């Protein structure tokens, strides 16, 4: 259990729909940009909550999964376990290299499993992150490929880019959000 | 509670931004930010310790200056913001016009001795699109 930073990693296609030459704004479970990823070396239970990101550099140690550089996104949504996959030919020993890799869907399994628990199956290194219901602006090229993305929760600039649906913003003052102060306690009389 | 506006000089100039928390006491919003008490938290955001209370709300990231210029991005009351050297985002009370001292005298008149033909323009939106909708 060590620590790594996810440098724009964990982006995937939200659906089976072709869109092109466009910025698509959507809320879904995504690995937040620069979230903390736990590093592992070698079989502990690593809790699964609201979607899990998994990756490994192996060597071929991770040869199975239990739910009850090769990288994947596993999410439990509306009765299905969705699995996304992708792979970078980069030789790294103990860290996720900084990088972006849009993942493509592999499975959509109708499994009535309350997945709260996750464990990797290790034969004879890997990383785990968590997804959050953040909003992203996904940049689609002319062939329906997501080549880039903006995490709308990262900073006020990113938020403004999402609000105006652009990577280029003109001059001015724009309302992008609304804030609320949250309670420090509970008074019952 | 209140709105949040993001103030930008335009990305063609700079991607640098300032944030206005509207209709709030600056002391309180600053505390909530440091106390992790705001709902729309920005994960890598930092105030930069340049917080200015204006009638419109708490303006964070703009420097306050004692100079004045023509209004560019209005904030509220007499405060406007723009991109200036001290470039950075600055807030200031806007200028109303040039400072002109006109003499008054009961025996003196100024009379133009030359002129300039000038051509200016006006633009007017005479028409809009003729849309049509099939209700059913």
């Amino acid at each position: 259990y060590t620590q790594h930073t996810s440098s724009m990693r964990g982006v995937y296609y939200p659906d089976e729909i072709f869109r092109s030459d466009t910025l698509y704004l959507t809320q879904d479970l995504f690995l937040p940009f620069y979230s903390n990823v736990t590093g592992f070396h070698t079989n502990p239970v690593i809790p699964f909550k609201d979607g899990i990101y998994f990756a490994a550099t192996e060597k071929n140690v991770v040869r199975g999964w239990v739910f009850g550089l090769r990288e994947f996104v596993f999410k439990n949504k509306d009765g299905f376990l969705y699995v996304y996959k992708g792979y970078q030919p980069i030789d790294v020993v103990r860290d996720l290299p900084s990088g972006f890799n849009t993942l493509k869907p592999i499975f959509k399994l109708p499994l009535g499993i309350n997945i709260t628990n996750f464990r990797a199956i290790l034969t004879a290194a890997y990383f785990v992150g968590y997804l959050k219901p953040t909003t992203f602006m996904l940049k689609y090229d002319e062939n329906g490929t997501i080549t880039d993305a903006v995490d709308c929760s990262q900073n006020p600039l990113a938020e403004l880019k999402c609000s105006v649906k652009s990577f280029e913003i003109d001059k001015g003052i724009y309302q992008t959000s609304n804030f609320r102060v949250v309670p420090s306690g509970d008074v019952v009389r | 509670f209140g709105g949040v506006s993001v103030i930008t000089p335009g990305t063609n100039a700079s991607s640098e931004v300032a944030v206005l928390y509207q209709d709030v006491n600056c002391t309180d919003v600053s505390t909530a930010i440091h106390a992790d008490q705001l709902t729309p938290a920005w994960r890598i955001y930092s105030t930069g310790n340049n917080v200015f209370q204006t009638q419109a709300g708490c303006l964070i990231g703009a420097e306050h200056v004692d100079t004045s210029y023509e209004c560019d991005i209005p904030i509220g009351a007499g405060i406007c913001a723009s991109y200036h050297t001290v470039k950075s985002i600055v807030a200031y009370t806007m200028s109303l016009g040039a400072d002109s001292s006109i003499a008054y005298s009961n025996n003196t008149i100024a009379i133009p001795t030359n002129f300039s033909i000038s051509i200016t323009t006006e633009v007017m939106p005479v028409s809009m699109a003729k849309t049509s909708v099939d209700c059913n």
Epitope: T5, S7, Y34, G86, Q88, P89, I90, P97, S98, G99, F100, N101, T102, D141, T145, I146, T147, D148, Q154, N155, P156, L157, A158, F167, E168 | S15, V17, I44
Partner: antibody, heavy 126, light 107 residues
Framework: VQLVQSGAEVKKPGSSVKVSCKAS????????VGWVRQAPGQGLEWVGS????????NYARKFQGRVTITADKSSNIAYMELTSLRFEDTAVYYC?????????????????????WGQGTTVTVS | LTQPPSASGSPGQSVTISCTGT?????????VSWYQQHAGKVPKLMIF???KRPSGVPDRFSGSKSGNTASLTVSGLQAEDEADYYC???????????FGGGTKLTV
Amino acid sequence: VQLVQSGAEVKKPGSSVKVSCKASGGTFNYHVVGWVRQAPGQGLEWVGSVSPALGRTNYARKFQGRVTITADKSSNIAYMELTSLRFEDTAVYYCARLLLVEYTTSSRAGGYGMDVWGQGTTVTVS
Amino acid sequence: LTQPPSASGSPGQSVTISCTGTYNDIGGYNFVSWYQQHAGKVPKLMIFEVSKRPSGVPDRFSGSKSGNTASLTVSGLQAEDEADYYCSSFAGSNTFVVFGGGTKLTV
């Protein structure tokens, strides 16, 4: 790997020059090739880049309508064509390999720094 | 991207150079590199990632990033370090790379 540049070039005040860079003792592979306009006595600025693996490019806004950056992975040589070259464009014109590697349009890894630099192609324009 | 025009200190001194960004460039992305350039020389990469040093660089060179500010530290400054230092960063995909001006360090 050592990037090798052309050099000692002198050009007219309204001209077109193509600067070449070869990857010697290795290949460009997936690395992005960047170009930097450092002017004599001045700091340095980005001109643009090409990624030989994809054929994709990037330009600094100043050169968007002035400089064409290309590469041909089969000769393993990168090129920069500076058109409408002006007096103000005198520079050492360094080329360099970026650490960033692009595998496909949606997959890339590594940082944006540059490890392997050529010796520079000084282009003097009168 | 903004850098001071100069930096200095005694040999053996810890001397730093700062760079300021935005929510792109330095800040927004963890891709801030530094270069050492002696007059007449090709810039040498000194820092690859915000804190990660490339091979071929002595361990007196290190750095970090806080907020939107990057910092280069040369601990145990040598005469051989009289060079300009430049920082650059991933500017986002439209600009791709942005550089500040050089900071000349004097020993």
